[PDB]
Design a protein around this ligand. Sequence first.
Ligand SMILES: N#CCC(=O)N1CCC[C@@H](n2nnc3cnc4[nH]ccc4c32)C1
Length: 281
Amino acid sequence: VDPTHFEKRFLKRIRDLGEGHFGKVELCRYDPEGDNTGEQVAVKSLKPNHIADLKKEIEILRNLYHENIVKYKGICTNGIKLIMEFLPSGSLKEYLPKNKNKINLKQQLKYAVQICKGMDYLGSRQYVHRDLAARNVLVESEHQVKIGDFGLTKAIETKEYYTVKDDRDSPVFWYAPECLMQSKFYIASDVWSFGVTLHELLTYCDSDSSPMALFLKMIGPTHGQMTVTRLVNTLKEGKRLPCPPNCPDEVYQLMRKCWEFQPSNRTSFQNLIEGFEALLK
Ligand SMILES: N#CCC(=O)N1CCC[C@@H](n2nnc3cnc4[nH]ccc4c32)C1
């Protein structure tokens, strides 16, 4: 028997966990016994082409092994489903609003370290994530977080960046200037998205403090097609997202080092780790 092969007949849909534009993740129970004692697993499938994309995401996740990366469990098979461990606390977007009392600054800085280690492990395997947002960070417990989606993850050739072809559903408010302008994607461009994720983490993912809601105030919500070009000017000028409430200046400076206009002048994941670890001591 292949413990990574899940049979369709025993894979039972419970509820939806989230969706992209072509993908969706559901909570399922893999129940071969038929008595509802089987394990709960998270299942990624296509929304009814993108089979090639999902297949590449599977092969990428299958070979990543890190405590801050959601565990690959297997596949369900021309169609295919990705089986992962299920994390009941969901994403930081779900968890943080409901757990402000439990999650103090020290714990948010520990989550920040964990995101950086998982992201640094990804960079080391020569991958650019391209979609680092609090909605993609899963909560394992009060003491641990995991990167939980690799839907936009691309390999970097030999080259320092991956060049973007499809960009119509780009999370623009999480994107570095080189991504919004040229459509290039470096490890340093994931550092920029980490800065924005760190901002979300510090504001406990509150809808009103979202990087989009905030950036739409800094530019205007009624600009339709011109939003990105107007956003590109803001960053060109030198305007950044504000310091989150109750966020120490030492923390906000580590965040600003993620937001240098030029990728080569940006901090690394290793520097952020050292910087966060010094504040925790
Ligand atoms: N498609 C897509 C993205 C998507 O559905 N999500 C973003 C990544 C995390 C997904 N999610 N939400 N709650 C979850 C609990 N356990 C999980 N295990 C794997 C994903 C996942 C969960 C939800």
